[PDB]
Amino acid sequence: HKTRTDNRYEPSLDNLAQQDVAAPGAPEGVSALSDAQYNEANKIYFERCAGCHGVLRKGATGKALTPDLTRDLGFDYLQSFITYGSPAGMPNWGTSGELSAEQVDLMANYLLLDPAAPPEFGMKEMRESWKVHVAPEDRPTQQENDWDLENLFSVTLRDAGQIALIDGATYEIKSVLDTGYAVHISRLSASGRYLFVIGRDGKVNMIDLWMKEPTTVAEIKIGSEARSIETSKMEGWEDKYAIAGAYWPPQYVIMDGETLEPKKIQSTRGMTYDEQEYHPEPRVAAILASHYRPEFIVNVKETGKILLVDYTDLDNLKTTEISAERFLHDGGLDGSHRYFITAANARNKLVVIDTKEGKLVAIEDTGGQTPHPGRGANFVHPTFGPVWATSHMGDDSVALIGTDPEGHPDNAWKILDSFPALGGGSLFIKTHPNSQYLYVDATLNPEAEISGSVAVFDIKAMTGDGSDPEFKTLPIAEWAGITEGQPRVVQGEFNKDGTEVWFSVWNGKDQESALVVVDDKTLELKHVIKDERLVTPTGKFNVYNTMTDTY
Amino acid sequence: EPSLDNLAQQDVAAPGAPEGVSALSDAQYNEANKIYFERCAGCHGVLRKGATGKALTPDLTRDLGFDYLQSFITYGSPAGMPNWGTSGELSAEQVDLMANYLLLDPAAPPEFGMKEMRESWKVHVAPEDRPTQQENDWDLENLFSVTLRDAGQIALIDGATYEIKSVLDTGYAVHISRLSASGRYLFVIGRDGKVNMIDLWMKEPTTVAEIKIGSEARSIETSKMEGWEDKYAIAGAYWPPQYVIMDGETLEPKKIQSTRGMTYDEQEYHPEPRVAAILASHYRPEFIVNVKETGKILLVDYTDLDNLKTTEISAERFLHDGGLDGSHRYFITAANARNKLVVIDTKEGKLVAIEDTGGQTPHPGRGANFVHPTFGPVWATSHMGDDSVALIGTDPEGHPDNAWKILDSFPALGGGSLFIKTHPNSQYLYVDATLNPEAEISGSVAVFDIKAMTGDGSDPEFKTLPIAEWAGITEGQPRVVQGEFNKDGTEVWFSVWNGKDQESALVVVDDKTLELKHVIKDERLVTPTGKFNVYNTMTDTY
Ligand code: DHE
Ligand code: DHE
Ligand code: HEC
Ligand code: HEC
């Protein structure tokens, strides 16, 4: 129950927490909570508890807290356990997990009551939220602005509920657009025309980059809590579909790539792969798109299943439900784009799927604590050959896995090396084919100087002799020149040419933030992006690198 | 509609009552709970989300109020809701208990996963210890496996001598018997979710393995793709909503799949999508699973249970029973409440047609395939809701215009039909009328002469066989049900189903002459229902 470096990246269901619930009746031996009391506790539960224990309390990373179990444990036991506080959430916006005496008692009582299941969100609800602002026929048939679309960066302005579209070469903010709250990620259609963003509240906006003044052409809500979205990337299926994944309800939705019409909703409720026990809250995590078959690649967290969803026929729906490892989160494709490599973070494993054959190929422990790759980093190691790398939230380690069964069979799907970077609390590792450098952030590190810096390894100097590769430390936050607070540096993203790498210098909503552009060839400061509209900059996605999965 | 009597034997704790609602004691609540599952959940759902009856969830019931609930439960209504109070079925006190129960928040019903299945899993005779060849002198292919419903037993009856070879104790009210593809293993599934596997090669055939797969179940099937003989068995449950693939030699539970999910049309989450009929493909190594409330037909590929390939086919809600056409390529199934037949191509794994039968509530069983003299290959179903028999063309290549179209519809004995039957060696089509209110009809079967069918629009005449009268049974309500042929297709058996404390029988009809051949009576023959001939079941010959 204490704040660790790798247990702050758990879902915070604060959109779902805004919903009012009814106070349930209490069985013998338990006292009922009033309307206000129950809602107050429920709000606290959804905000700072449901991530680990579930909205239904059936357990996720933390054990089940269902009434049968809690009543047997008792109030006193729960009261004393809960009085210590809960693990803090994410900086600049998460909770500290600090509850008072009034709050501690409420939570213990709440746990003894029978939880109601939050509302579902089906086709009826999605279609009511579905708005097409500019029908396809009224859109341009060619690019009508003079922007360099492929070198554009789509930047989340988290707490402002906006995104910024920034010129990759001039650093000019081309436009700031209103979207869903706290957009989690931006994704691009395969042609690079359409920009899709998903907010944590389940709101999806679709933006047409060919318009003289790009704006939202369609929107829809797919759930109450959502984090992922992806576009069809199989050759021949460019711009055909988009897919969104939600934490609640546990489901994914396949939408029309031009209009966002909801075409197919699939529940992810089901059995765990290992113990084969029903789980009523299997959250959708990362969603990728196959380059080998017309399929979406969907990580289902709590049941530990990777779904290969064939979008060629939504009525006679072909899926492959791959038993993998529980706690699947994020991942990426290898350099050849054939293998999906994903972190079952809580179990410290990397699951490898062959997207061509539709089957599990390997499961390997990284030797680190809580691997968090993002999409990861593919590069050619001088000794090992093609590798994919991940850093970790729980420790300072960077792990390399061999990704070339044909050319380097002895190294394929084995952890080939593990070495330290700046410190624990890393979120994102990054490289590019044109770069000789591997960048590693340390976003969640408790030490301000570490969290405001990035480690940079010289790939060319790597020998894989077992020693610890040296790294250069770039003082990104210092380069940005921010006086107030202790801004967190997060997520490297390259430009189209792979000559410059951008980092977010993420400060609070009413504090000063920036984007820092690094010249990859020299590792020197190229440019500092500051603007009054640049509020809480987090994720940044280069159009070309996102549409092509170049990482 | 289903009766979840097994789920009702569980004692649940009395839940809390929110403000404005009166609480029930543990005893009162438990009494109401048992009644709910035993008599109410079939139509209303275990979770009270509604199926054939309206939803009875607390948000809806509280708006209606106690008085409304009490009145509705007492006098019922014309639209399918029994008059529990005025009929005397439930005492006045029990009616009030149910009204109060409906206003309360029901605890979630127990799940039944791998741990629970493995705990119930018993292997009496390991495969290594079983015979390597048939060790009895029985003609196994001509053997009939007959449910003795209320006795929780089955009777293995010789197809030629009509001798009850053995009476075996199994799960309560076995719903169906199924045979492995080799004809060696006999699988039965009780309503309670209990599966028994019997080795017919033993000197004295008995259960070699058993397992429980849920709380309420109705379906079981074996792997029938060439090369996959005896490899797997699959069972389907009403509760929990799931299907389980088991090892075909030991019953080891290998893969459990939840059927909870979205309805095909309105795409809304449904928390209780019951598994109905389960068939086995002859074109691909797949099981064919009907999921009732969501209207999905699942094609589940058993070649790899870890990287599980399925095809979820959007069909029509209320899928129940069905069968393969004569070629064994197309699966034709009734979406009964919507009066539709859904046709799936098992080779291509896609929906091919959805057609209304023109009748009310088609109930085919596995149906009846035959070559109609003018229409070509057809598949027939009778109906529960009316006296009609419908024919659908099943030959897209050879009779294209007729394929997947209702080609003829004509009357049989009356409404309340459950099973229609024929055999390739027979020229007759037999149709029961089991649920008809008229005893004369309920104890008789209609027989149509396929050779005389001209498909000219006129209604084909039928002969009426007085099955119950032939059995010499008039006491109680002897309800004649389900024709089943012997291996050669020269005789047809019907069950004369009477109450457990009444006299029942099996009636064997000579298919050539349409005359009484033999009456099977025995004190052990309690409530005989389903009968399955080993050869006809293993080969899907119907
Ligand atoms: C499932 C998921 C993905 C994969 C998306 C995909 O495949 O399309 C993802 C990716 C991401 C990516 C993708 C980077 C990439 O290069 O692919 C980024 C930048 C990101 C920035 C943040 N994430 Fe993320 N993130 C969650 C979930 C996820 N984050 C959480 O449940 C969580 C932990 C808290 C929450 O309630 O949302 C969380 C907190 C954060 C942040 O506090 C971050 C740093 C900032 C923010 O804007 O909210 N997450
Ligand atoms: C899902 C299902 C199947 C398909 C099995 C398969 O594919 O393996 C089926 C088949 C059947 C079959 C298969 C016949 C065949 O030739 O395939 C028979 C004989 C049968 C005898 C009865 N069924 Fe059945 N039956 C139900 C369900 C089902 N019955 C019910 O939900 C229902 C309506 C009520 C109930 O609570 O069980 C019900 C009442 C009955 C009877 O009252 C019957 C007549 C007698 C009995 O023993 O309970 N059902
Ligand atoms: C993720 C970091 C957590 C958050 C946020 C909260 N809890 Fe938790 N809890 C977590 C763990 C890892 C564990 C230990 C057991 C395990 O799963 O390994 C727990 C345990 C509890 C308990 C103890 C119950 C028991 O059976 O001993 C309680 C009562 C509990 N958690 C309640 C709770 C509440 C009320 C929270 C909101 C503030 C909360 N937890 C947050 C992980 C995490
Ligand atoms: C299937 C034959 C049923 C069984 C067994 C029971 N009920 Fe029923 N119920 C059924 C239907 C088809 C309907 C719809 C209303 C109509 O006009 O027929 C109902 C309705 C109810 C209601 C009223 C709900 C409303 O009006 O919105 C109640 C309170 C109800 N049913 C309760 C109930 C109970 C307690 C039962 C067990 C004794 C029971 N029903 C059995 C169908 C069937």
Which residues of chain B are within 8 Å of residue A32 when distances are taken between CB atoms?
16, 18
Report the alpha-carbon distance of residue A433 to residue A549 in Å, rounded: 12
Active site residue B246: no
Cα(B385) to centroid of ligand 4, in Å? 20
Report the alpha-carbon distance of residue A377 to residue A403 in Å, rounded: 11
Q: From the annotation, which residues of A make up the binding site for heme d1?
A: 9, 12, 93, 158, 184, 187, 200, 227, 247, 375, 491, 538
Of B513, B411, B541, residue with least CA distance to B141: B541
Report the alpha-carbon distance of residue A26 to residue A115 in Å, rounded: 11
Report the alpha-carbon distance of residue B51 to residue B55 in Å, rounded: 8
Find the angle CA(B258)-CA(B264)-CA(B270) to the nearest 5 degrees.
Answer: 45
Residues 6+ apart with CB under 8 A from A152: A165, A166, A167, A168, A174, A209, A542, A543
Active site residue B225: no
Amino acid at B25: S
* Sheet architecture: strand order including B515-520: B479-485, B491-497, B505-510, B515-520
List, by residue number, the catalytic residues of A: 49, 52-53, 90, 329, 372
Find the angle CA(B345)-CA(A263)-CA(B278) to the nearest 5 degrees.
Answer: 35
Q: Nearest CB to B267: which of A26, A122, A358?
A: A122
Report the alpha-carbon distance of residue A132 to residue B132 in Å, rounded: 68
Report the alpha-carbon distance of residue A235 to residue A337 in Å, rounded: 13
Flag whether B54 is marked binding.
yes
Q: At what angle do helices B26-35 and B92-102 cross, to 10 degrees?
A: 90
Report the alpha-carbon distance of residue A511 to residue B156 in Å, rounded: 82
Q: Residue A424: what are its φ and ψ, rounded to 5°?
A: -65, 170
Of B186, B187, B212, residue with least CA distance to B200: B186
Which residues of chain B are within 8 Å of residue A58 when distances are taken between CB atoms?
none
Interface of A with B (CB under 8 A): 22-28, 30, 32, 113-114, 116, 120, 122-124, 249, 251, 262, 264-267, 269-271, 275-278, 313, 315-323, 358-360
Report the alpha-carbon distance of residue B238 to residue B217 in Å, rounded: 5
Of A540, A423, A527, A550, residue with least CA distance to A490: A540
Question: What are the CA-CA distances from residue A431 to residues A387, A434, B14 (Å)?
Answer: 12, 9, 60
Q: Which tokens in the block code for residue B437?
A: 């209110």
Flag whether B218 is marked binding.
yes
Domains observed in chain A? 20-119 (1.10.760.10), 120-551 (2.140.10.20)
- How many other C-beta atoms can be found within 10 angstroms of the C-beta atom of residue A482? 19
Question: What residues are in contact with ligand 2 under a 6 Å CB criterion?
Answer: B 1-3, 147, 149, 173, 175-176, 191, 218-221, 276-278, 321, 365-366, 481-482, 529-530
Instruction: Tell the burial category of B41 from Cβ atoms under 10 Å away from its Cβ (0-12, 13-18, 19+).
Output: buried
HSE-CB at A550 with a 13 A cutoff on CA atoms is 20
Question: What are the CA-CA distances from residue A310 to residues A155, A243, A291, A523, B315 (Å)?
Answer: 30, 12, 12, 43, 18
Say whether B522 sits in a helix, a strand or coil.
Answer: coil
DSSP code for B245: E
Whether the CB-CB separation of B24 and B100 falls below 8 Å is answered with yes
